[PDB]
């Protein structure tokens, strides 16, 4: 994810959860040289990324 | 008095301009008091001041200040003339009783400089060519 740069992990976590009715194991953020905050979000093992990609439309 | 604030004697330049110990402020001390009290209470607007007591080393000037924005002053006229934004710090411009004595105005054969508005606006007028249109 690209994320709004003032975001914390507990905000990114209660975001990604709220929306793609998902749940999140851990968040892990950097700031791209460009100012865009990335955040790559591990999803709990019961629960797949490759499915929730197609829901959110990416792939 | 006042003391030319320069590193050591070092009043560089010509031997007229060449002093430091013995020389005096233009204003009076009372007007300095008014200055500094009106400069503390920047909200408040300075009126005017008595003398209370003196020493060899100081003078004790007690100063009358006003809130422009006690309703006890906006609402009563006569007093409601300080409120107006013109009078913002009267004591810094030299409009106080004491503060004006320094400017050296009056009427007559001595208040001749300051015969425009003030000391400066005398000469603004005298050191100008009125070069008319039409010559």
């Amino acid at each position: 994810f690209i994320v709004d740069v003032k975001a914390n992990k507990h905000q990114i976590k209660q975001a990604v959860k709220k929306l793609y009715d998902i749940d999140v194991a851990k968040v892990n953020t950097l700031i791209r040289p460009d100012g865009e905050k990335k955040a790559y979000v591990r999803l709990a093992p019961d629960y797949d990324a490759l499915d929730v990609a197609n829901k959110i439309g990416i792939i | 008095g006042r003391k030319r604030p320069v590193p050591k004697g070092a009043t560089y330049g010509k031997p007229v301009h060449h002093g430091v110990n013995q020389l005096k402020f233009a204003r009076s001390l009372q007007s300095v008091a008014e200055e500094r009290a009106g400069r503390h209470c920047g909200a408040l607007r300075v009126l005017n001041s008595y003398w209370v007591g003196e020493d060899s080393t100081y003078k004790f000037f007690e100063v009358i200040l006003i809130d422009p924005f006690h309703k006890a002053i906006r609402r009563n006229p006569d007093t409601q003339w300080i409120t107006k934004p013109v009078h913002k710090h009267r004591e810094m411009r030299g409009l106080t009783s004491a503060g004006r004595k320094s400017r050296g105005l009056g009427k007559g054969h001595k208040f001749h400089h300051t015969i425009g508005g003030s000391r400066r606006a005398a000469w603004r007028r005298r050191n100008t060519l009125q070069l008319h249109r039409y010559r």
């Binding site: 700031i31 040289p33 460009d34 100012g35 | -």
Partner: protein, 50 residues
Amino acid sequence: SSHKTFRIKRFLAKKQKQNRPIPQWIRMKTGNKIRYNSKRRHWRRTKLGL
């Protein structure tokens, strides 16, 4: 520097985005005087605002 602040990072981010060319389509705009960017920087010659 590898130890940057954020304030310094936010600079370069900006500066970095300011280098890209001109979109070709600009040159078709009705009333142009614009042909090439002309405020471009190169790390080696012209050394940032730092």
